[PDB]
Swiss-Prot record, chain A:
Its job: Shows activities toward both dicarboxylic and aromatic substrates.
Gene Ontology BP, a term: L-phenylalanine biosynthetic process from chorismate via phenylpyruvate
N6-(pyridoxal phosphate)lysine carried by residues: 237
Statement: the UniProt record of this protein carries the keyword Cell membrane: no
Enzyme class: transferase
Positions that bind substrate: 28, 59, 121, 174, 365
EC number: 2.6.1.57
Protein name: Aromatic-amino-acid aminotransferase
Keyword Amino-acid biosynthesis set for record: yes
Swiss-Prot record, chain B:
BP term (GO), one: L-phenylalanine biosynthetic process from chorismate via phenylpyruvate
Localization terms from the record: Cytoplasm
Main location as per UniProt: cytoplasm
Entry protein name: Aromatic-amino-acid aminotransferase
UniProt family annotation: Belongs to the class-I pyridoxal-phosphate-dependent aminotransferase family.
EC number, UniProt record: 2.6.1.57
GO CC aspect terms: cytosol
Catalytic reaction list: an aromatic L-alpha-amino acid + 2-oxoglutarate = an aromatic oxo-acid + L-glutamate
Example GO molecular function: pyridoxal phosphate binding
Cited function: Shows activities toward both dicarboxylic and aromatic substrates.
Cofactor(s) listed in the protein's UniProt record: pyridoxal 5'-phosphate
Organism listed in the record: Paracoccus denitrificans
Top enzyme class: transferase
Residues holding substrate: 34, 65, 127, 180, 371
């Protein structure tokens, strides 16, 4: 039986972990001055508090715990959370939220298609391929200006049919780092409303862009216009609990009836996949969010991280500027999030990794959190050496 | 679009507790619970587990992404706990999953990848979630006779006759021990014969192992699995740490793929890592780490085995007590099966009608198929259950 198993292609981004004066600029995890991904202060305190308060580990809720569901809703939608018409499902990380999102939509529309950005998180297409869902792309990254080809994007999206799903990154677009402004978001909402396409928002970096509330701005605008929208959130990065596997799927419906319908299907979806969702991570998140003292320090630490990385981009761009006398790499300072695509070709990037020992994702995607004052000039020189 | 959704039925377990709570009777009893409960009606956190969580809190320095298929310490410790000295790593693939249920879902997905025309055989009866997951996947499900309603024991003759019909490439799901919901179990000699049937048919064994340590002991409960593992070249095992470690909500389990050779093992392992990746990327870390900590740390392990044994013996005492009470009140040994059953569950064999009469007249609740949880019994509740059973005419 098993001998008939066909070999499968690995995760190229995760492969870099294996492929690693080495400079790690691959996998999207935050790193500090000394190349460490620390546990946030609030998270540690949450765990300590949990170690004392929990008296049992019996089966809990199939859709996650109410405290988590509520906390997460308010974090993402703020005061735009109409719980009466919102369904929530605790999933195994943001990735689980996406898979669960695709399954839910496919249940309501066997003939659904998914539109993804050119380019997008490869794992998006991987999952869709596995499920056998037709994937179409829309123009997004303007290769020349390193910005967003808004004209192209609006053009392709206008071709989506009712029942189709459009996958938008809430903010901090992985892998480009190029993001839409709120004005562009309003226009996109105009298109979606007219096309009847279901918006699927992948929110994995709320807090690394421009701030907790600012990064959720776009998602809130869509939710305020479009009567039905899906949001897949990840607590992996903004809470630094990557290995805990915690996120959630939010299903915004047009009315309570549909909400009860969706919520039912979402719970059933967990039951048939792995039964209950993991408790530990969801608990840390709600504990932090519902405890004023814990929330205050978390926001602060996330702010320091976010502001610190902002500083790094400016340095890197400046370094390169002084090393070329050209505003070419200006896009680095404009980009927002953890990543930024240098625009280097596959031949160049490979040369860099083998000789310079600096490993970045094949499409020239660099994790700016992997840089620091010591490595910045080295990277600048390394890319200056060839092309760019 | 979401309005086109089909109304999905509730989990039912909630509906059970719904009527129970609504019951104004001060002396009502709940034997329908599916988790373990101590003398005080609580599901405590095992001592070793609270110890592991304390050490993890002090030593963990990061929470970055870890093993896609799980961590090595967990995989090895688990394979050893299940297969003992018989663990042949060279041909064994391992996958940390989201609980035993996740392990089951992945096993089915894996097999279906290897054989599109996969057909599954499940016992009569079996854990309802088995059928639901399979129906959801659209896999053809077959049943094999297992529970004898009259003796409350295993209908082996019938089991053999039905399993004989399995074809090359079909899957046969076996409960490694403590059969949920029945409580009736196969002896090592019956396992040997089942082994011969599977060898002849060329069917792939999928062993569901969720109660290791609740039957006769850790080693004894793995006995059947180990006989199969040694005689059958390809075997899939879905283990759960929920019950025997008491970490239900943490969602810890693992899929073990025993292969004929290393080339196949590499094929299976990759396919499993891919399956995890295409579902939720990485499996939950916390629960698995508690487990690897208890099993590797001699002190904790010793205290865990000690606590599990206490739990196991306690339930066995309850079985003997209830069976004894039933013997005196009935003037016969007709209810002896209660003491022969292993696991925390037992199917009494009462008709849905008798079950309803038991609830209304004695305030004793249980699942509709007459399945009761031994752990929910105690010196005060046993005399009552004994009398209810006999008075209703079971
Ligand atoms: C991180 C990330 C996710 C989800 O990550 P999980 O580890 O599964 O929480 C989803 N999409 C993108 C773009 C991400 O960067
Ligand atoms: C409990 C149980 C499982 C596993 O439960 P998980 O909670 O998902 O670890 C699987 N099969 C049977 C028969 C069970 O009783
Ligand atoms: O680096 C990234 O793209 C996102 C972080 C790494 C990954 C996580 C999950 C699946 C992949």
């Amino acid at each position: 039986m098993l001998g008939n198993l066909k070999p499968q292609a690995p995760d190229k981004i995760l492969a870099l972990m294996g492929e690693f004066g080495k400079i790690d600029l691959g996998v999207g995890v935050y790193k500090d001055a000394t190349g460490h991904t620390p546990i946030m202060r609030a998270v540690h305190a949450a765990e300590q508090r949990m170690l004392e308060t929990e008296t049992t580990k019996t089966y809990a809720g199939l859709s996650g715990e109410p405290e988590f569901q509520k906390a997460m809703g308010e974090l993402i939608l703020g005061d735009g959370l109409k719980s009466e018409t919102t369904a929530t499902l605790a999933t195994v990380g943001g990735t689980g939220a996406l898979r669960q999102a695709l399954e839910l939509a496919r249940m309501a529309n066997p003939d659904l298609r998914v539109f993804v950005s050119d380019p997008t998180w490869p794992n998006h297409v991987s999952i869709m391929n596995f499920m056998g869902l037709p994937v179409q792309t829309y123009r997004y990254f303007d290769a020349e200006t390193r910005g967003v080809d808004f004209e192209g994007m609006k053009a392709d999206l206008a071709a989506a049919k009712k029942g189709d799903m459009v996958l938008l990154h809430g903010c901090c677009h992985n892998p480009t780092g190029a993001n839409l402004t709120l004005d562009q978001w309003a226009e996109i909402a105009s298109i979606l409303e007219k096309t009847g396409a279901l918006p699927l928002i992948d929110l994995a970096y709320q807090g690394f862009g421009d701030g907790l509330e600012e990064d959720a701005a776009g998602t809130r605008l869509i939710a305020s216009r479009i009567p039905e929208v899906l949001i897949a959130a990840s607590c992996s990065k903004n809470f630094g609990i990557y290995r805990e596997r915690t996120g959630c799927l939010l299903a915004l419906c047009a009315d309570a009836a549909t909400r009860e319908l969706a919520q039912g299907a979402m719970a059933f979806l967990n039951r048939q996949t792995y039964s209950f969702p993991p408790f530990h991570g969801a608990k840390i998140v709600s504990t932090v969010l519902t405890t004023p003292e814990l929330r205050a320090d978390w926001m602060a630490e996330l702010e320091a991280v976010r502001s610190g990385m902002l500083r790094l981009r400016e340095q890197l761009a400046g370094e390169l500027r002084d090393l070329s006398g050209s505003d070419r790499f200006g896009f680095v300072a404009e980009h927002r999030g953890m990543f930024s695509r240098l625009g280097a070709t596959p031949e160049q990037v490979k040369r860099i990794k083998e000789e310079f020992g600096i490993y970045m994702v094949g499409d020239s995607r660099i994790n700016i959190a992997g840089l620091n004052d010591n490595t910045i000039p080295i990277l600048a020189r390394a890319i200056i050496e060839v092309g760019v």
